[PDB]
């Protein structure tokens, strides 16, 4: 639509705008290693995080 999604090392989840670097929503949870992502999946409107 306008957007892409990432899932980084710093446990963040972002929803960047694919015309210019800018954020719509972060959902940073936890610096320390009990929120570190291990997989990711997009069902075409939503996401899934483990």
Partner 1 sequence: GMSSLYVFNPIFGKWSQVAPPVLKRPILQSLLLPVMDQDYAKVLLLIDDEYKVTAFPATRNVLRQLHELAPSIFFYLVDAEQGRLCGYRLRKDLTTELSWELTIPPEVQRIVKVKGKRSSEHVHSQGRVMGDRSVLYKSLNPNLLAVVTESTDAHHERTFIGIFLIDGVTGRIIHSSVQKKAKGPVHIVHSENWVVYQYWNTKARRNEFTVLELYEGTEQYNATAFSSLDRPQLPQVLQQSYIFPSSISAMEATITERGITSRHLLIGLPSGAILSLPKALLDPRRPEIPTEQSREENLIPYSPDVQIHAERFINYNQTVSRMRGIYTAPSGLESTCLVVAYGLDIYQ
Partner 2 sequence: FKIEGRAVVPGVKPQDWISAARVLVHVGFLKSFVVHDIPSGSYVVEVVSPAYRFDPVRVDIKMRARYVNYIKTSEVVRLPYPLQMKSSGPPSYFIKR
Point out which residues bind partner 1 (CB under 8 A): 10, 12, 26, 28, 31
C-alpha dihedral, 6 to 7 to 11 to 17, nearest 10°: 10
27 interacts with partner 2 by CB under 8 A: yes
* Partner from partner 1, partner 2, none contacting 25, C-beta within 5 to 8 A by type: partner 2
- b/e per residue 19-32 (b: at least 16 CB within 10 A): eeeeeeeeeeeeee
Q: With CB under 8 A as the rule, give the number of residues binding partner 2.
A: 7
Residues of this chain that interact with partner 2 (CB under 8 A) are 24-25, 27-30, 35
């Amino acid at each position: 639509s306008k957007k892409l999604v990432v899932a980084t090392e710093k446990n963040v989840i972002a929803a960047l705008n694919s015309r210019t670097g800018e954020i719509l929503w972060r959902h940073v949870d936890k610096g320390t290693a009990e929120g570190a992502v291990d997989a990711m999946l997009l069902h075409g409107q939503d996401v899934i995080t483990v």
